[PDB]
Amino acid sequence: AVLTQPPSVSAAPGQNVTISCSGSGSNIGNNFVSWYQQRPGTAPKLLIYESNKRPSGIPDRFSGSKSGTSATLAITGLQTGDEAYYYCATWAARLNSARVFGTGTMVTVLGQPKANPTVTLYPPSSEELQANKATLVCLISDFYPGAVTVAWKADSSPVKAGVETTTPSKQSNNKYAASSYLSLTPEQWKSHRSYSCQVTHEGSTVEKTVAPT
């Protein structure tokens, strides 16, 4: 079981944003929810506890609500320091291989125009195949805001095993970059007609495809 959150939300300074946390039932539906903030190179910080109560020192901009199996965090008057990751949590969600924390969500304070990712997908080199290894490489560059969702497919089928993906990183031109690798046996590689890398960013998904020679 999981507390699913949106991968990302974005807004200009001063605007309002909302973040959802959906579960059940046995967790949210009958239990308190807490929200935590985490800025890049620091430790998490409690923003909300008992659904809507703030600890001391937390701006009144941050508010929490809860309805049915969904909880919600709300930030009014977005400031630049609000750009961070946000996680929802409930102490009930530990009880069956389930995760206490949400997924969670990246909040972006817009400070430049949005940019769609340039996606490049490389098949395994012949040199790597002669070494009895196959690695598919998906490179995603020059996108903003810095949040993407990468998914792999083998022909029409979805893939999750053998996949590793990096967190987005700030390039020199203030835009973001990321990469995803799909590690593979030449048998697996040759067994399908094609493999595809699907990158999702801002209501758009670009899929690139490669096939055995």
Added chain:
Amino acid sequence: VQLVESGGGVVQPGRSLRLSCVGSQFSFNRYGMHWVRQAPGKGLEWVAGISFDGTDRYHADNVWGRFTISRDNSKNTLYLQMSSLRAEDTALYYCAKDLREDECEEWPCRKSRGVAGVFDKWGQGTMVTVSSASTKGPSVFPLAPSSKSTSGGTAALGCLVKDYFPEPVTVSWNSGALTSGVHTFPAVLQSSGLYSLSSVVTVPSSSLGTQTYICNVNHKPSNTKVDKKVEPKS
């Protein structure tokens, strides 16, 4: 309120490790405590929890039967005894304080409030790495341009730097004579403990029959350098 973690280093699978978190500037004996972990660069994951006196212990199912949380209030110290480590246990381990202030009401403690499951204070954390990998240099493979690039526009050519340890690795192109059509990406932590990254450069397609392109990888921790020529091939 201060939480300081320690004990986190590199370690091999199957073996063991004991993490420690010392707390100060608060009544450590009145609050429950939690161990929470964060693998890079992912989300938070609650590992273990303990009440103020240690009568009530909680462990995630990921670690049930191989991790054990404990505390010594006489020394204001929290302990996480990890055994049978796995590569999946590789993460940054945070010590976190439970929100609820607790005292015993009836006489272990018969009647109590218990932990709340809310983490109001954290402590930067200590890194635990599980890898059976000793120091070794990378294998470099060419990421060749698309065949459908001949004449006209542009082409992305790169090199894949695979299976090395530890960090860091650096990549240049043509000995520094080529510095921007260029992206060098962060590395990934493969399941084998070994690291991998890629570097790509975008150039004109007409230049792919005259100009030679070479990626220069440097991996100092293993005293290795690798120069790889990236050809269009057929």
